[PDB]
Design a protein around this ligand. Structure first.
Ligand code: 7BV
Length: 432
């Protein structure tokens, strides 16, 4: 061993009661009441949407879906590239306890089928450009009984938009600010079904998102709740990195600036013009910005951190990127789809080259001997194992693949090789 088991410190605020939908509802209502509070900004088209707008459309979607008949026995799919509308049905469903399975908007038809065959959605929200794939998947999966278009105001090609669907199902005199999100068992009600790294379905109870919201506004393990904080996120919303940072930024009242096609100039200009304080990159963009020479042309003085996750960041490209951006280091974190979000996180300003962080509040982490199972001590390399309240509840209708991952005592076996050091910073070893 127990000197060799690394434990998450204490959360700076304790763990809120209520479902993830109740916690989102309460914060967003608060932001909704101050006019002009920006929730999302689309860098390509330059449009802002406020928390008032976001809050009111999510509450209406929640009530419409409820009046349509969806409940905890149901799942919806959200199949769209990152967009201003992406999170409206996501929030709507969380408010009423309907599980959300976000679908890779660039899966081809076959991966979409396999994804939605596991998720078995009753309703699909889709962007215009994904409709024809969903219609082909629907032919094979008639459990899809209702298709709603996300990025339209009017009806589109015979299908309702979110806005016409909402009107079709709101009671007269619906009041967005009197709406009360559903109360339910957060341990037992699934919030998200996420796709596995042939893909599997990862069920995440509302609880795992609630713990994530603790980290997100933790001053050491998340971000400080400070007005006019803006984040430029270039990560897919349909995977856990983008899903659970974005929901955390919404809980925090941040301005989330998005882009879904990378462009060097647009990214750098958006950093500058939106006075971005924190940038979110997928790791292959780190290899890009190690090569970019245009960074010094831009006023990046507001930039406090560049965050990384989800894949291997080497000590080399990280140091290269930090220098091109004149930052102390890279702020990094480690988790799996099966782990909700990041379980190891660089504490703010406690950055170390090559390390992905320390054990987050509520969790524990060890490295075990690849042959026996016994717990190792400082700087010994073995398998990375973790345990805590963000671990998935299981794979959708795949119990053997679940139990091959978590022992009877609840340790998730990362399948990664790791060590921790004298300050308890963790390091992931590339097997190659
Ligand atoms: O690679 C994966 O499978 C995915 C599963 S979810 C995940 C990560 N989620 C997150 C969520 C948050 C972060 N942070 C950015 C780094 C500094 C602040 C801590 C959160 C890093 C990661 S990495 N990576």
């Amino acid at each position: 061993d127990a000197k060799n088991i690394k434990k998450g410190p204490a959360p700076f605020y304790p763990l809120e009661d209520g479902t993830a939908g109740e916690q989102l509802h309460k914060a967003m209502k608060r932001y909704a009441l101050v006019p002009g509070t920006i929730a999302f900004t689309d860098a390509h088209i330059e449009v802002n949407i406020t928390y008032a707008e976001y809050f009111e459309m999510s509450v209406r979607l929640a009530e419409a879906m409820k009046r349509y008949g969806l409940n905890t026995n149901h799942r919806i799919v959200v199949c769209s590239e990152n967009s201003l509308q992406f999170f409206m049905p996501v929030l709507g469903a969380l408010f009423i306890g309907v599980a959300v399975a976000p679908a890779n908007d660039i899966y081809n038809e076959r991966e979409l089928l396999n994804s939605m065959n596991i998720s078995q959605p009753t309703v699909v929200f889709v962007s215009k450009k994904g409709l024809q794939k969903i219609l082909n998947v629907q032919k094979k999966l008639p459990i899809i009984q209702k298709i709603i278009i996300m990025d339209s105001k009017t009806d589109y090609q015979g299908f309702q938009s979110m806005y016409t669907f909402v009107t079709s199902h709101l009671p007269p005199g619906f009041n967005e600010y009197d709406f009360v999100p559903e109360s339910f068992d957060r341990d037992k009600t699934i919030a998200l079904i996420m796709n596995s790294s042939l893909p599997k379905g990862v069920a995440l109870p509302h609880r795992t998102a609630c713990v994530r919201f603790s980290h997100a506004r933790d001053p050491i393990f998340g971000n400080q709740i400070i007005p006019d904080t803006a984040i430029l996120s270039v990560v897919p919303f349909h995977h856990g990195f983008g899903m659970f940072t974005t929901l955390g930024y919404l809980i925090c009242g941040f301005r989330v600036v998005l882009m879904y096609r990378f462009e060097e100039e647009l990214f750098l200009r958006s950093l500058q013009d939106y006075k971005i304080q924190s940038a979110l990159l997928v790791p292959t963009l780190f290899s890009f910005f190690a090569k970019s020479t245009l960074i010094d042309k831009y006023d990046l003085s507001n930039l406090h951190e560049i965050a990384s996750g989800g894949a291997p960041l080497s000590k080399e490209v990280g140091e290269a990127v930090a220098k091109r951006f004149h930052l102390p280091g890279i702020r990094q974190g480690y988790g799996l789809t099966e782990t909700t979000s990041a379980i190891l996180i660089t504490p703010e300003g406690d950055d170390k080259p090559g390390a992905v962080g320390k054990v987050v509040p509520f969790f524990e982490a060890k490295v075990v001997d690849l042959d026996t199972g016994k717990t190792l001590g400082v700087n010994q390399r073995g398998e990375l194992c973790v345990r805590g309240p963000m671990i998935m509840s299981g794979y959708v209708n795949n119990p053997e693949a679940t139990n091959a991952l978590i022992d009877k005592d609840g340790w998730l076996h990362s399948g990664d090789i790791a060590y921790w050091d004298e300050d308890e910073h963790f390091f992931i070893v590339d097997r190659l």
